[PDB]
Write a protein that binds this ligand. Structure first.
Ligand SMILES: O=S1(=O)NCN(C2CC2)c2cc(CCc3ccc4c(c3)N(C3CC3)CNS4(=O)=O)ccc21
Ligand SMILES: N[C@@H](CCC(=O)O)C(=O)O
Ligand SMILES: N[C@@H](CCC(=O)O)C(=O)O
Ligand SMILES: [Cl-]
Ligand SMILES: [Cl-]
Ligand SMILES: [Cl-]
Ligand SMILES: [Cl-]
Ligand SMILES: [Cl-]
Ligand SMILES: [Cl-]
Ligand SMILES: [Cl-]
Lengths: 264, 258
């Protein structure tokens, strides 16, 4: 019954968790900065526990293997007892809800389209009705699962192309997808979550943009293992910080307050 | 055995059908939350009976009595097994009842008569010609009372003591007040209901500015209820299948008079 340090699994994803400039001479949680770094501190204060930030070893959000049927990423860390809690841009999904707990959402997002400025694309329907511009998603994430399991005509049509496109249209990190859009002269569009799309749109060289409306509506939740006694208090902490307006303050802090692409 | 569902008459969520007087049971009602209750019950495999909350209130706790009214009280005191309604997820409610993951997004918004010289909550707080208020016994009123944000705290100080009362008992009452006040009244309501009214005749109201907060509606059950697990998974399933977006388009825009 003695108080133990809470093991927090997170992921290096800008601006949620980022290496500080002088990280090579810093230790522990001091190495990291970002939205989820500030959020982890706010949560820990309200719940009154100590915690250690740990980057997920495999750098994945969470997917279940078809053959082995074992969870990887931050989800696996919680399922197999490697971490006590996940504080990261982890999307709430049906399949994950069955195996882990999710607090009420702390941030909203929907799948969106990233294009290099000037690309003749305005919607997912435009992508599905053409072949000149390739497009893909992140691996081991909820966006890829959205298209694989979608029974909607446009989305089902897009998945049928992406799953067998050559060379692979999928990426293993968001930065990989951003670079692919930037160095493809408009011949590649990246399907990612609106939160990350809006952030990149505010970073140099300011050559990308979110186009069209979102394909779905969901949020990020603070995840814990099923039955964890921490879930109750953290859930109330999220709602408290939301009502106080802190969650709105943190987004502006890490998305627009230091936007490198103008004042607007 | 039959699940008692408490809901509230709020368009387009729950509405009396035409010729409802010769109908009985769940067939008397139509709307977004009526379809949602059917979708949820089908996925969880239970029978249910729709009942309008007796006091016609969403849910607030009396300061002295500490007694919950509205649909929240129905769940706390065992009068209903589940609430399927535009019930806002809030911190104070989370302490006393369970909430599924949200099934619809909303934020506090401003309703004005078209042409009113107002663009933000900050504009309202910095003037006195145009009155403004909220619904009683709801989450919007509680948001302003408990807010330490400068603009919202300033707005609450005015509304709590304005005469005549700027608060209303129903959404329809607030809509009417905006329409026949020649722009000297703005109504603070949730964006979902603001967007619906904006698409209804006489098309003389509009939603202005961004929302003041960001939250959602959740399917509510008593704390510890065994139903909470199945309904929560049902909501997420309907979300990923896209049926929640379908129902939204069905009851908000598919019949637009503006
Ligand atoms: O994956 S979901 O759970 N399932 C389905 N949907 C869709 C609507 C059908 C959504 C939608 C959202 C965004 C709207 C929303 C709802 C509730 C709350 C929000 C923001 N906040 C704000 C900080 C962001 C705080 N607490 S809160 O009051 O709970 C998030 C998660 C999901
Ligand atoms: N937030 C996603 C990862 C990013 C994406 O899939 O676009 C997840 O939890 O899997
Ligand atoms: N959805 C709101 C309605 C009343 C309000 O606008 O605050 C509630 O549950 O209280
Ligand atoms: Cl320890
Ligand atoms: Cl009605
Ligand atoms: Cl009638
Ligand atoms: Cl019936
Ligand atoms: Cl039934
Ligand atoms: Cl709240
Ligand atoms: Cl302030």
């Amino acid at each position: 019954g003695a108080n133990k340090t809470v093991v927090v699994t997170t992921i290096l994803e800008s601006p949620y968790v980022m290496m500080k400039k002088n990280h090579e001479m810093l230790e522990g949680n001091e190495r990291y900065e970002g939205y989820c770094v500030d959020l982890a501190a706010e949560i820990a204060k309200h719940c009154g526990f100590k915690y250690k930030l740990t980057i997920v070893g495999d750098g994945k959000y969470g997917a279940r293997d078809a053959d082995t049927k074992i969870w990887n990423g931050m989800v696996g860390e919680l399922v197999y007892g490697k971490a006590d809690i996940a504080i990261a841009p982890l999307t709430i999904t049906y399949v994950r809800e069955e195996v882990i707990d999710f607090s009420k959402p702390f941030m909203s997002l929907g799948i969106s389209i990233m294009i290099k400025k000037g690309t003749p694309i305005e919607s997912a329907e435009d992508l599905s009705k053409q072949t000149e511009i390739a497009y893909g998603t992140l691996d081991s994430g909820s966006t890829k699962e959205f298209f694989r399991r979608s029974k909607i005509a446009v989305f089902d049509k897009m998945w049928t192309y992406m799953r067998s496109a050559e060379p692979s249209v999928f990426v293993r990190t968001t930065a990989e997808g951003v670079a692919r859009v930037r160095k493809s002269k408009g011949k590649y569009a990246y399907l990612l979550e609106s939160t990350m799309n809006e952030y990149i749109e505010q970073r140099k060289p300011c050559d990308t943009m979110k186009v069209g409306g979102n394909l779905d509506s969901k949020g990020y939740g603070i995840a814990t293992p099923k039955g964890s006694s921490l879930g109750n208090a953290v859930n109330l902490a999220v709602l408290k910080l939301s009502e106080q307006g802190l969650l709105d303050k943190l987004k502006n802090k890490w998305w627009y307050d230091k936007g490198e692409c103008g004042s607007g």
